[PDB]
Amino acid sequence: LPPPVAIIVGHNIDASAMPLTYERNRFVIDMLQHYACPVFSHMNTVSSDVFEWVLEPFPVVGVEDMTAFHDRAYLNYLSIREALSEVDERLRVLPDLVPIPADEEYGLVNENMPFVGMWRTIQATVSGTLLAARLLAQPGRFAAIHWFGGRHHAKKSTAGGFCFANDVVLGVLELKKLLSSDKNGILVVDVDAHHGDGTQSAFLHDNSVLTLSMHAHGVGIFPGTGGIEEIGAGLGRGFTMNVPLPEGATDILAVTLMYRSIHFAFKKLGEGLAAIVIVCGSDALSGDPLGALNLTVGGMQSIIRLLLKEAARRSLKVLLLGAGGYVDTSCARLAGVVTKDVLSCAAAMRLGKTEYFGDSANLGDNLGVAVPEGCEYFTRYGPSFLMHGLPPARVSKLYRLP
Ligand SMILES: Cn1cc(CNCC2CCN(c3ncc(C(=O)NO)cn3)CC2)c2ccccc21
Numbered sequence: 001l002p003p004p005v006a007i008i009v010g011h012n013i014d015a016s017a018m019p020l021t022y023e024r025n026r027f028v029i030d031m032l033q034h035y036a037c038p039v040f041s042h043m044n045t046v047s048s049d050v051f052e053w054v055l056e057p058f059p060v061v062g063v064e065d066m067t068a069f070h071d072r073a074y075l076n077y078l079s080i081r082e083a084l085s086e087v088d089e090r091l092r093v094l095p096d097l098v099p100i101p102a103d104e105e106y107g108l109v110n111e112n113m114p115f116v117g118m119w120r121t122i123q124a125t126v127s128g129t130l131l132a133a134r135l136l137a138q139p140g141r142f143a144a145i146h147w148f149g150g151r152h153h154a155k156k157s158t159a160g161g162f163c164f165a166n167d168v169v170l171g172v173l174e175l176k177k178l179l180s181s182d183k184n185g186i187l188v189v190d191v192d193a194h195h196g197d198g199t200q201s202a203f204l205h206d207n208s209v210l211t212l213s214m215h216a217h218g219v220g221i222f223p224g225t226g227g228i229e230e231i232g233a234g235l236g237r238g239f240t241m242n243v244p245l246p247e248g249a250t251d252i253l254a255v256t257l258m259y260r261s262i263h264f265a266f267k268k269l270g271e272g273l274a275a276i277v278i279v280c281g282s283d284a285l286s287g288d289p290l291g292a293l294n295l296t297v298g299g300m301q302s303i304i305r306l307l308l309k310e311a312a313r314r315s316l317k318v319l320l321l322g323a324g325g326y327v328d329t330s331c332a333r334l335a336g337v338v339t340k341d342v343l344s345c346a347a348a349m350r351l352g353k354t355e356y357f358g359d360s361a362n363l364g365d366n367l368g369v370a371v372p373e374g375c376e377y378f379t380r381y382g383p384s385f386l387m388h389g390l391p392p393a394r395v396s397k398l399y400r401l402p
Pocket residue numbers: 111153160161162192193194219220221222223224281283290291323324325
């Protein structure tokens with residue numbers, strides 16, 4: 001049997017890096033190596049019974065690996081768009097291309113402007129998430145972790161919210177087709193600060209994939225959808241869930257409501273639940289410039305521990321993806337603690353334990369967990385260098401619903 005956790009990294013961690021968050025993958029991997037992995041192992045020279053640090057081999061993906069969800073014409077356009085105009089010169093890495101009229105049909109405008117390397121970035125993202133799903137489906141595999149995925153806004157034939165191809169959807173479809181067609185129900189829990197509208201759209205009529213999105217909601221809050229009334233259509237009625245939070249919501253609101261929503265989702269799927277897909281965006285954390293919430297690291301950690309605890313107890317499968325997150329240190333902090341929770345969870349399972357998080361600090365009550373001094377980016381975690389440290393709140397904190 002393989003190690004129960006697969007961590008999908010690759011040889012080039014910048015391959016999937018997006019223009020606005022170009023260094024973020026580096027912060028995240030740095031924190032995994034120094035915070036999450038050491039206690040579970042003895043970086044290509046690491047030995048572990050708990051996790052596998054996956055650098056090879058990433059599948060080569062093209063248009064035909066994305067047509068399971070996306071329109072072929074849209075994908076063909078993405079595949080050749082960088083040949084269709086010049087770099088706009090009127091000095092950021094991966095710079096924007098000159099816009100052309102054919103971009104408009106597909107939403108490849110504004111935040112979704114084409115840029116050099118776009119198709120290579122899309123390929124690396126989809127490749128990693130498809131590899132994660134394939135390794136997860138293997139016997140003995142508890143979890144697969146691809147922090148570089150999570151492009152949850154992309155729709156069948158349109159880009160949106162910095163997302164071109166929806167690897168969340170493609171990963172759901174790939175994992176489902178490799179699970180026993182007796183028991184292959186999927187729960188997708190999206191705790192990025194914005195509505196998971198692309199994933200929702202893909203499964204709106206579907207009663208075998210339950211999409212649950214927590215997000216800020218209100219005037220001026222992208223993408224403007226995801227009210228409580230969106231519950232799905234047709235056979236999918238009841239299998240779409242949204243928890244729209246008021247701008248600035250804190251843990252007491254988000255954690256409480258999500259605990260209730262997750263438990264209801266567990267009841268809705270019952271014994272057909274085979275896997276939980278987690279879309280973990282750190283832009284819901286306080287201090288984020290583009291998210292509009294005030295969750296803490298321990299708050300997000302606690303929501304996800306509920307999902308980990310359930311999949312561990314019932315011997316299910318967990319696919320963990322990233323998403324948004326526009327403070328690099330906050331992204332790495334959250335990825336470090338969530339990954340360590342998954343590792344501690346998987347190790348406890350193999351030892352037949354019933355406590356799953358004994359080897360990973362709960363930041364909700366351990367308020368002194370240090371950022372490891374060995375981190376390459378250690379000096380960026382000031383002024384206090386603790387794993388729960390967040391920037392000051394950008395929007396005022398809300399503890400009660402209006
Ligand atoms: C469709 N639509 C377009 C706008 C105007 N654009 C503003 C946004 C703000 C900035 N932006 C954006 N995208 C993705 C993320 C993310 O993390 N998604 O998980 C965050 N931020 C795109 C543009 C807008 C504002 C409110 C509601 C809907 C609206």
